[PDB]
A paper describes a structure:
CueO plays an important role in copper homeostasis by oxidation of toxic cuprous ions to cupric ions. As with all multi-copper oxidases, it contains four copper atoms distributed within one type 1 (T1)2 copper site and a trinuclear cluster comprising the T2 and T3 copper sites. A distinguishing feature of CueO is a partially structured 45-amino acid segment (residues 356–404) capping the entrance to the T1/sCu copper-binding sites. The goal of the current study was to engineer the highly compliant MRS such that CueO activity would be modulated by engagement of a partner protein with a scaffolded peptide.
Having delineated the MRS subregion suitable for introduction of peptide sequences, we produced two additional constructs (CueO-PMI and CueO-PM2) using previously identified higher-affinity MDM2 binding peptides. The affinity of these variants for recombinant MDM2 (residues 6–125 comprising the p53 binding domain) was first measured by fluorescence polarization. Both variants showed high affinity to MDM2 (apparent Kd 28 ± 1 and 25 ± 1.5 nm, respectively), comparable with affinities of their unmodified linear and stapled versions. Whereas the activities of CueO and CueO-HA were similar, CueO-PM2 showed ∼2-fold reduced activity, indicating auto-inhibition by the PM2 peptide that is relieved upon MDM2 interaction. The reduced activity of CueO-PM2 compared with CueO and CueO-HA along with its impaired Cu binding suggests that in the absence of MDM2, the PM2 helix reorients itself to block access to the sCu and T1 binding sites, most likely by packing adjacent to the CueO α5 helix. However, in the highly similar structures of CueO-PM2 and CueO-12.1 (Cα RMSD = 0.22 Å), the MRS-PM2/12.1 regions were not resolved. The rest of the CueO-PM2 structure showed high similarity to both the MDM2-bound form (Cα RMSD = 0.3 Å) and native CueO (Cα RMSD = 0.37 Å). As the PM2-containing MRS retains some intrinsic disorder, a transient conformation likely inhibits CueO function, with all or a subset of the Phe, Trp, and Leu residues in PM2 contributing significantly. The reduced T1 copper occupancy observed in CueO-PM2 likely accounts for its reduced kcat, with this phenotype contingent on either all or a subset of the Phe/Trp/Leu residues in the PM2 insert. In agreement, CueO-PM2 meets this criterion (kcat CueO-PM2/kcat CueO = 0.32), and MDM2 binding results in increased activity.
Author numbering: 29 to 379, 402 to 519
Write the structure that this text describes.
């Protein structure tokens, strides 16, 4: 009858021993009345919100209760490579690995997910993702909405496709290696079109695009504005009012939205210009969740000023690193053909071993050979080109929060000008200003890769190390 309520990830903080336990395991979820095998952190699906504090360290004990290897990448955390959880962070099935997270970065919503070599897309599709809520001394002074699960709410948005038996229907084949794995069912914290009761006043949504390959574009059903207050790596200097908010795979934004009177409204996602992603029902605005106003306590506010953003340093004398993304023309031809044959023209609306056909600087990912050594504690200019390549590539660099200088041909939109760990590359060139505060040796290198997961799984990744020059 009624919509399910929005599931709220548990806020998970350290214990008296300053430890946090994460169990990775297989269970069961229900989607549209049909049960499915799913994977989760501390549960059947998705995961908790690990809560960290700047200036404090926590030890996370990770128990892998799957029957296959996995890793745990702390997406957005400025931590050394040894705990970064790239493909070299193997956790054996039935085994346990512990990492120390010594947090030293501004308040932010980050997240965590597998980075198993060649299998990251499958493991995310099966259910593995969690959140990270970093707080500091600055953000709690602001009196933003702060009641977790009431007026401060995480919103993890993901698509899946299921086979007739109800099971998740994941495949890494020549089509998905080209355009990505995408589905026809939209999930919001694991539920289909849930409702969230929100007190009158301001509602804070921590948005995460957790799709393998689908880009999203958030808006409200009645075109009330969203006020962006934070990006991947934390607060903007001041709120940025937008009518729609595109969000790439793996990106987070925090928005405030007004909840007035008592009329419900929807958070929705608007059709995107991305290949494969405008097939019905995604050819039209698609609801994400229903917001239901209520009359309980809430004192959160939208501040005029949020934080201070340092100036972009001088580009003069900085090391420039060039990263050329590419796809084997045969993969582009064959994958495109299969997409068009199956879905037809709508797959372009609004516009052979494939396992190593996606590449950076002419090379599919080689775990034994980091491509370069970056300087610790020094700004570098990284130039990432998708010239000659049709596809969307949200490009993620581990171990940093960087500043976008140029995004795919233009300066970043204001709400994208702050701290980011992902930058858009699509048929043009992006430039980012990056600094690495922590070491990563050859045996636990940082990754830089496309976050369209099927591209990463088929080669579009490089490792790099960081050491004091």
């Amino acid at each position: 009858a009624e919509r399910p309520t929005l599931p709220i990830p548990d806020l998970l903080t350290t214990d008296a021993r300053n430890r946090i336990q994460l169990t990775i395991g297989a269970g069961q979820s229900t989607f549209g009345g049909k049960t499915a095998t799913t994977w989760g952190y501390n549960g059947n699906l998705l995961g908790p919100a690990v809560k960290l504090q700047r200036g404090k360290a926590v030890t996370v004990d990770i128990y892998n209760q799957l029957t296959e290897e996995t890793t745990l990448h702390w997406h957005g955390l400025e931590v050394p490579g040894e705990v970064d959880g790239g493909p070299q962070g193997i956790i054996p099935p039935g085994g346990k690995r512990s990492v120390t997270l010594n947090v030293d970065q501004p308040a932010a919503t980050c997240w965590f997910h597998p980075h198993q070599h060649g299998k990251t897309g499958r493991q995310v599709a099966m259910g593995l993702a969690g959140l990270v809520v970093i707080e500091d001394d600055e953000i709690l002074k602001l009196m933003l909405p702060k009641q977790w699960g009431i007026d401060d709410v995480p919103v993890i948005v993901q698509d899946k496709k299921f086979s007739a038996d109800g099971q998740i229907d994941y495949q890494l084949d020549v089509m998905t290696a080209a355009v990505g794995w995408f589905g026809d069912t939209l999930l919001t914290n694991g539920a289909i079109y849930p409702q969230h009761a929100a007190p009158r006043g301001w509602l804070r949504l921590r948005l995460l695009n957790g799709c393998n390959a689908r880009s999203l574009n958030f808006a409200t059903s009645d075109n009330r504005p969203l006020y962006v207050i934070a990006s991947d790596g934390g607060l903007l200097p001041e709120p940025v009012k937008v009518s729609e908010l595109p969000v790439l795979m793996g990106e987070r934004f925090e928005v405030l939205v007004e909840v007035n009177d008592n009329k419900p409204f929807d958070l929705v996602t608007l059709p995107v210009s991305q290949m494969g992603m405008a097939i019905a029902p995604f050819d039209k605005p698609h609801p994400v969740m229903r917001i239901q106003p209520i009359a309980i306590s809430a004192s959160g506010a939208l501040p005029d000023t949020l934080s201070s953003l340092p100036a972009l340093p001088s580009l003069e004398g900085l090391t420039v690193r060039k990263l050329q993304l590419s796809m084997d023309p045969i993969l582009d031809m064959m994958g495109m053909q299969m997409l068009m044959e199956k879905y037809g023209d709508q797959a372009m609306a609004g516009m052979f071993d494939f396992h190593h056909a996606n590449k950076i600087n002419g090379q599919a990912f080689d775990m034994n050979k980091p491509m370069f050594a970056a300087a610790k504690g020094q700004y570098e200019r990284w130039v990432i080109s998708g010239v000659g390549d049709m596809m969307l590539h949200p490009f993620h660099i581990h171990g940093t929060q960087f500043r976008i200088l140029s995004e795919n041909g233009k300066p970043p939109a204001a709400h994208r000008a702050g701290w980011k760990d992902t930058v858009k590359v699509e048929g043009n060139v992006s430039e980012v200003l990056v600094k690495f505060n922590h070491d990563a040796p050859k045996e636990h290198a940082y990754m830089a890769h496309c976050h369209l997961l099927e591209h990463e799984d088929t080669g579009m990744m490089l490792g790099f190390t960081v050491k004091d020059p």
